[PDB]
Write a protein that binds this ligand. Structure first.
Ligand SMILES: *[C@@H](C[C@H](O)[C@@H](O)CO)C(=O)O
Ligand SMILES: *[C@H](C[C@H](O)[C@@H](O)CO)C(=O)O
Ligand SMILES: *[C@H](C[C@H](O)[C@@H](O)CO)C(=O)O
Ligand SMILES: *[C@H](C[C@H](O)[C@@H](O)CO)C(=O)O
Lengths: 298, 298, 298, 298
């Protein structure tokens, strides 16, 4: 029930000096809302939270929540390694008017299970907002297993969902059976574009995926088709989404690629990104372009 | 060769409210310098850099460098995921009087090899201090391979060493043969207590390891015995260091364990640690104590 | 394009003394062929090749080829760690009448790339039969990357396909774009049930998956529906396949589970399995049964 | 304590046609016994067990036991993935007069813990010989944890040791503390040359390592020096053993390297290896030679 459907992890647009580009972030927000998304997620991996300072993250969230102005539910990513900062950023998000926070597990130290449960319990106790967990074991080095997530949802009634970013049908399936089986309204969202369709067929709730920035219409139409019972139309959109993640191989981090994609699909924003990411080179931008053209996305 | 010998990663002592405990950190620094260490390293993993804000880190470094007062070479850990903050903290360290900085690879995104080389070169070019790399793949999920380290030392003459924190004889051997083979004065330090002896026999330069906090005499005497040609005496100290790391299994993070050991070995400092670390329980503190007694360290 | 469509990895039926159960394996083969499969694959992981001796494997292959009697194409798994034995089994297979061989990479030693290419080239040179590569990195510890596989298909014109057994959309998608892009008639089959549909939509050719033994009709009808352009009907069958692999968690190895399922779905065969696999306990058999009933498969 | 001290995993010498070279294997066995080793281990990873058929393995063990003629204790490696074959090879070893068997875990399927404990209990019940376990998780993909090993020693009184092949001080220390702490006469042997000294200082029992083939005097003298209380002398030998494993990087599998080193150090045996290993090229042979010369081994 909370935060279901298509919720893009919005890119943060920066100027050439690495300050928040308010007109470009605002235009991107407005494109997304006009495309019919179900909510917006700021300061996720795509939004570059890990390359920003805490004061910067507060300013971005505040701007973003204000610009959205309640048109769609807003989530703010408040996680990191500094747990005291995670509480600060989460309390700031609630005060600023966000609808929910998304909290990754600490990704430097892989803390013991007892420390990890305590960390999420404390973060959840610091706010009255709904809390979405964030699994990204390829970057964190520490999986949030279905059993662990179930124990968290048993322990705190404001822990109401998960963004599960993993290329694994078994992990999504098992997350759904174990957690939604005990908690029917717990939300399961996949973090990869090419798992949206399977997520839905498995009993999950939608996606928070990078292609939400530059082709939201494909995910939004997939979901609308699926909700209407037109499974073949849904499967047609899925065939596009199956191919999209090729582009993510172009660079790592690929936050540059997603911005270059937003431009190519018709929204001229500054593509600047924060170190240690770097501008995409021209030959790879052309490769991105041919991929987008083959998929009829620009 | 810069920063060789025994260089503890000093614990940061905090009060119950999580603020820097100045008298306790100072007492700890003084004990360590009296024990005959060759340098001090503040805000490494043991010093809890990843649970501290940037302004807290600057304050800690400033205090520590000031208290040390040039009695031994001082290293400051400046790394993180936010590269702009890395440059800020590194430039701050230089201006505050540090003798070198210690920079881990970004540990959220495992960035491409080209972004990674470009990150270290930018960090190096932001200061005129010597730079020590920090490899801790168990936590980062991205190894700094001997071939990669060699390429950084070939590219920047102020990248002069590495702290290699890995339980692997092969990795230390290869780091020494590959990098010290091209760069005879490049410093190789192990990050685990039980690899100090082998690092020395391999042609490496010493250790930055946690037991430096609570039993610096063991490492210090091992290096002295080694430098004196008394290999059997060195090997006797090694036998104690082989056993110490058992304690690190008592909790994760084990920064709490290191502080509880500082107290048990005779220095009564506050043992508070920052979340998501937590206080060590009384039964595990009793287990630590009986271990320190069996090793004759208290 | 050779060996496309639905090709079960057939269980080998054994008696209570661990000998080939000819009547039971024959009835299983017959059920499968009547179900409309496009081929049959004996002595894969599911047929227990790794628990059988070389003479046992020759006997089983000969029986199975003779029983099939050319009704559908027959593949024999001839791989292992003993490369001399792989050539013996492969030449035996050809002499006995098989239509192709399936060859995993060596899975004890992960051999260097040069030795690996040389191994597959020698195997491929030993027979005139088509050769299907078998990638199962969860078990082998050594992935057959799309680049490597392309190199092998460039090198030997009888290396014509791959069974790719990995819960990874990216791996499938990349195998298809890289290998089929250079070699349009190179066959890509997925080894997991719940990747069949995606495999088809990505441009691949079918599946060799365990549920082919006890519910072939689901895969067969999915392929038929897809080939007819009835995508929604295909997606219906996909919804069942998405759920089936839950049963594989019951035991490891789960070759017992597969045989227990064959019985439950209406083919009473001896379920004996070779050590170190063991009989499935009754509570887990009942668990399997409830999973089959929920999916309307018995 | 059974099977302690220096026990080489003997290379199996083959003729150009891949048959057992009896004069060369015999000469190698005699060289080893003359050098003062404490036992000999045939058909481990370096003896190429995984590239041999069962009838070949039997012939080799029979020959090797017979040649040794009880001058030193003899171990035979009997493991594989075919558990019925493991029992046949182990009962054959006993009947052929072996003193013990060495049994790796199944390395294709990583069987469930319950299947793994049953496997080892069944193998141990099939003979009245002592059984040494063999941990090689880089190749097996499944670690024998100290806890699991303790459970096996609690379960069967003829499971009396382990060959722990892993570049990990923690793994050795923990195997010693957990297993030898419950079972003081259980034998812990390391499988890598550069962990012999540490294994001894940790309370362990010796090494089964590749350099036993071509330079057994180094391990033999280290152990002698250690037993004599001349720790400095032991450490001098350790310094050579720290350097030897560089050569194992020359090829993979490196069984070819080990035989080229046997020749270079003065015993002219055939260096044929079984596929998928291959002959070492001349430039790498010249590299191995200069390494052996720098270490004063030829
Ligand atoms: C989330 C979206 C996921 O994690 C990306 O990896 C691409 O789909 C995010 O926070 O950026
Ligand atoms: C360095 C010491 C290493 O990393 C620890 O893991 C323990 O010896 C540090 O910066 O803490
Ligand atoms: C192939 C089928 C694959 O590998 C299994 O893992 C089950 O889908 C086989 O050879 O058994
Ligand atoms: C044992 C020795 C180990 O496993 C090698 O890796 C080299 O010391 C063996 O059986 O070969």
């Amino acid at each position: 029930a909370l935060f279901t459907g298509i919720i893009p992890p919005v890119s943060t647009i920066f100027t050439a000096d690495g300050q928040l580009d308010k007109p470009g972030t605002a235009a991107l927000i407005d494109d997304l809302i006009k495309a019919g998304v179900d909510g917006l997620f700021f300061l996720g991996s795509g939004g570059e939270f890990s390359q920003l300072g805490a004061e910067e993250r507060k300013a971005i969230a505040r701007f973003a929540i204000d610009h959205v102005d309640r048109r769609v539910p807003v989530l703010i990513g408040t996680g990191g390694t500094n747990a005291r900062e995670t509480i600060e950023l989460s309390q700031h998000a609630q005060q600023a008017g966000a609808d929910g926070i998304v909290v990754i597990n600490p990704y430097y130290w892989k803390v013991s299970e007892a420390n990890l449960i305590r960390y999420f319990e404390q973060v959840a106790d610091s706010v009255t907002l709904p809390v979405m967990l964030y699994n990204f074991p390829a970057l964190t080095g520490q999986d949030l297993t279905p059993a662990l997530v179930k124990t968290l949802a048993d322990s705190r009634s404001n822990i109401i969902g998960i963004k599960d970013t993993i290329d694994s049908v078994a992990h999504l399936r098992s997350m759904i059976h174990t957690v939604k089986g005990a908690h029917p309204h717990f939300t399961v969202l996949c973090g990869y574009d090419d798992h949206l369709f399977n997520t839905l067929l498995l009993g999950g709730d939608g996606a928070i995926s990078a292609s939400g920035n530059f082709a939201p219409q494909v995910s939004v139409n997939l979901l609308k088709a699926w909700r209407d019972g037109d499974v073949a139309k849904a499967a047609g959109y899925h065939q596009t989404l199956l191919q999209i993640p090729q582009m993510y191989q172009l660079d790592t981090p690929f936050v540059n690629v997603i911005k270059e994609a937003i431009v190519l699909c018709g929204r001229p924003v500054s593509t600047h990104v924060l170190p240690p990411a770097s501008p995409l080179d021209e030959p790879r931008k052309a490769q991105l372009k041919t991929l987008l053209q083959q998929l009829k996305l620009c």
